[PDB]
Every structure is written in structure tokens, then in C-alpha cells.
Amino acid sequence: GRKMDIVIRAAWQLFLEQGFSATSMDAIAKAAGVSKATLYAYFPSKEALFASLIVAECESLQRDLPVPKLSAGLSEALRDFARQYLHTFIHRKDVAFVRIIANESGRFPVLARLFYESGPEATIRRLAQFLEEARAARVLEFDDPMEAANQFLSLVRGELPLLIVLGLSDLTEEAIEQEIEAGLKFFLKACQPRA
Amino acid sequence: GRKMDIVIRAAWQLFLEQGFSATSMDAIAKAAGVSKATLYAYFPSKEALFASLIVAECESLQRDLPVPKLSAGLSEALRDFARQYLHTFIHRKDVAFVRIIANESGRFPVLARLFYESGPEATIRRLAQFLEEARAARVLEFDDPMEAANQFLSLVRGELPLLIVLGLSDLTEEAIEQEIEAGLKFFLKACQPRA
């Protein structure tokens, strides 16, 4: 319980610095100061270990996103959600996770999909349920809620992933507000019923 | 002229195999079979050498894209451009190149920005000048052409880059047409003058 966490942190450190495949359960045990018997009692395999990291970190992220309320106002709800989406993008593991998994060159499709469904797709679904509410209230129009959620996020996140990866993204809070307001303005321009 | 190309290819080989910083002008000269005097006459520095590769690769990629014609029909033009834009992601034309810069962890911001401006931003600008024509023809409406171009591409590309990188994208031609049609439909829903 108290030990399992020292293992997690040691493993994360190695996965970042070297990648998944280049990190052995052997190295992990030694970095965390445990016997292999111990290590394997907590985690039946390196794949299971990484899955723990993924589900845990991804569920954590998902708690720091709001559940958008239509009572808050349509715009402010979306604006809030975008804001938190981008803060999580910038300051959390999603980029690191993707580098790590992308480095595996498709050797681990189950882990890849687990991340996708636990994070990115989960974000889409939360927003989608909110959008379904907004459409039920006749305050937005669109054929598919997931599709519309994905469109919204795509606009808001724009080309920030690329910029970050290249090390060119530097986003003050005011810079972020601008990214959001542009994305939102456009999204509403396409889904607000013209009237 | 040809002395210089054998060098380019040798340098690209090393940068791929070992990264930028781990590759020395010395190793490059020896791999290309030239004297250091010769090497440095063509390229004043390793940074300058990589810049040549960037400009060359980025111009190459830009020839793969159409120049969209408004005579073709608005939709079909955009649909063409989107189609060619996505081909770049699927066939991973940028990936090795970006990995090299990304792997420098922002030690070389000038080269990173040169790539950005020579590729990604260049794509935005081409589309932006087409959009500026469409607006002059009163057939689309928007305040800023670069912004609108970015929005268009963000919609179309959506989350495909991520899926590809994770090794979860498998796109039949029909699947691709669906991605495009969704992105375009939405873009037009916001910029076509509602009438």
C-alpha cells in the first residue's frame, strides 16, 4: 500500500527517461528497493503495472474536469470546460503518456487503447453528454453528440499539441483565454440555431 | 552541387540513427567521404546543415499539396485539399523529422521554429490565401483567413494524429472521406453565409 506507491513512482521515472520496453521489471525492483517476489506480488506483469499508471492518472484527470452544467450558461460552461481541458493538456501526463506509447511502435495495442479510452475518449464522452443536454434544450443543433464534442475539442486544442512537442508553446493564462474564445466563437457559429 | 547531396543524405542517415546532438560534423564528413575543409565550405555549421534539410524536406512536402481553385467548386476544392492534407498524416511523412527535433527537448528553438514556419504554418498560409479568395467572392464569411484556415485543418485532422501515433488508426479510403466530410460540413456550417 505504502510500498506499492514507491514502485509506481520508480516505474514512472524509468518509463519517462527510457521508454516502456527499455525498462525491465528487474530495473524497477532495484530502483524501488524491493525483491522481485514482492514486485510481482503487487503486479503480475510490466503491462499490468503500466495499466495501473494509466487508469489511475486518467481517472484523476477526469475528476479535475468539470461536469458542465447548463444552468451555468451555455458559453460559460463550455468556456470552463475548455479552460480545464487545456490546463490539463499543458500541465499533465497526456503528452508524456503518448510519447511513451508511441515509442512502442504498436507492440502494445491493448495499452494504447486503454489510454485512449481512459483519457481522450473519456473527455469526449463527458462533453458529449453535456452537448446532448444542450440539444435537448434546443439551444444547440447537430446530428451526433460525440462528433460534436470532438469538433469542439479539436478547435480549442487546435495546433497546441504540435507546438508543445516542438517546444514552442508558451501559454500565459491570457494566451489560453484567447485560444478558447476563438474556438468557442466558431463552434457556436456552427451549432447555435441561426434565428 | 552533387558533392553537397551526398553530404545531405549522409547527415540525414546519422540524425535518424543517433539524433542531432549526438552526430558530429566529423562523423558526417567521414560518412560522406569528404574532407572537413570541403564539408565546412558548403555548410558553416551543423545547425546550418540541418536547416538545409528542413527547408528541402518542407518544400518537398508542400509540392504534394494542391493549389485550390475556386473554379473547381468551393467544396470540391476544400475536399481535395483536405484529402491531400490527411495523406501526410497517414503515411507518416512528418514523423521521423519531428521526432528528431522533439528529441532535442527545446535546445534548438530556432530550428524548431524554422520547421514550424516552413511546414505546418506554410500549409495554413496556402489555404488561407485560397480562403481569402472565397471571401472576396462572398461565398465564405470570417474575420481572419489564417485563423479560419487553422480552424479548417483542426477540424479535418481532428484526433487522427493521436490515433495514428498510438497505432490505432486504420483508414480505408471510405473512412477518410467520412473524416473529411464531417470536418468540411461543420466548417461550412459556420462560414457559409446563412441565406
Select from A124, A142, A127 the least CA-distant residue to A68. A127
For chain B, the first-to-last Cα distance in angstroms comes to 57
Chain A: residue whose CA lies nearest to B164:
A102
Name the minimum distance, in Å, from the CA of B96 to any CA of chain A. Answer: 12
Tell me, yes or no, whether A162 and A132 share the same domain: yes
Tell me, yes or no, whether B163 and B133 share the same domain: yes
Residue found by looking up cell 494509466 in the block: A54
Q: How far is C-alpha A68 from the geometric centre of its chain's CA atoms?
A: 17
Residue that finishes a domain, picked among A31, A53, A75: A53
Q: How many CA atoms lie within 13 A of A187 on its CB side?
A: 28
Tell me the structure's resolution in angstroms, rounded to a single decimal. Answer: 2.9
Name every chain A residue with its beta carbon within 8 A of the beta carbon of B191.
189
Distance in angstroms (rounded) separating the CA atoms of residues A151 and B183? 8
Q: If residue A24 lies in a helix (H) or strand (E), which one and from where to where?
A: none
DSSP states of A124-187? HHHHHHHHHHHHHTTS---S-HHHHHHHHHHHHHTTHHHHHHHT-----HHHHHHHHHHHHHHH
Q: What is the CA radius of gyration of chain B?
A: 20
Name every chain A residue with its beta carbon within 8 A of the beta carbon of B150.
158-159
What lies within 8 Å, CB to CB, of A156 at 6+ separation is A82, A85, A86, A179, A180, A183, A184
Kindly tell me the burial class for residue A193, based on how many C-beta atoms sit within 10 Å of its own C-beta (0-12, 13-18, 19 or more): exposed
Report the CATH number that the domain containing residue B34 is assigned in CATH: 1.10.10.60
Boundaries of domain holding A13: 1-53
Tell me, yes or no, whether B15 and B58 share the same domain: no
Tell me, yes or no, whether B97 and B178 share the same domain: yes
Distance in angstroms (rounded) separating the CA atoms of residues B95 and B107? 19
Tell me, yes or no, whether A157 and A122 share the same domain: yes
Name every chain A residue with its beta carbon within 8 A of the beta carbon of B101.
166
Tell me, yes or no, whether A24 and A100 share the same domain: no
Name every chain A residue with its beta carbon within 8 A of the beta carbon of B85.
none
Name the minimum distance, in Å, from the CA of A149 to any CA of chain B. Answer: 11
Tell me, yes or no, whether B109 and B138 share the same domain: yes
Tell me, yes or no, whether B140 and B193 share the same domain: yes
**Alpha carbon distances (Å) from B14 to A80, B9, B109, B130:** 46, 9, 21, 39
B25, B7 in Cβ contact below 8 A?
Answer: no
B163, A116 in Cβ contact below 8 A?
Answer: yes
Identity at B91, one-letter amino acid code: H
Contact B112 A168 (CB under 8 A): yes
What lies within 8 Å, CB to CB, of A33 at 6+ separation is A6
Contact A167 B106 (CB under 8 A): yes
Instruction: Report which DSSP code applies to A192.
Output: S
Instruction: Report which DSSP code applies to B1.
Output: -
**Alpha carbon distances (Å) from B194 to A46, A185, B74, B164, B191:** 56, 16, 16, 36, 8
Residue found by looking up cell 555549421 in the block: B45
Residue that finishes a domain, picked among B53, B73, B91: B53
Chain A: residue whose CA lies nearest to B195:
A194
Number of domains in chain A: 2
What lies within 8 Å, CB to CB, of A173 at 6+ separation is none
Q: Cell numbers at residue B156, please? A: 479535418
Name the minimum distance, in Å, from the CA of A1 to any CA of chain B. Answer: 31
Tell me, yes or no, whether B103 and B19 share the same domain: no
Tell me, yes or no, whether A116 and A175 share the same domain: yes
Q: Cell numbers at residue A144, please? A: 451526433
Tell me, yes or no, whether B70 and B151 share the same domain: yes
Tell me, yes or no, whether A131 and A36 share the same domain: no
What beta strand segments (E) does B38-190 contain? none
Chain A: residue whose CA lies nearest to B98:
A166
What lies within 8 Å, CB to CB, of B140 at 6+ separation is B74, B131, B134, B148, B191, B192, B193
Contact B157 A154 (CB under 8 A): yes
Q: Cell numbers at residue B186, please? A: 461543420
Distance in angstroms (rounded) separating the CA atoms of residues B26 and B11? 11
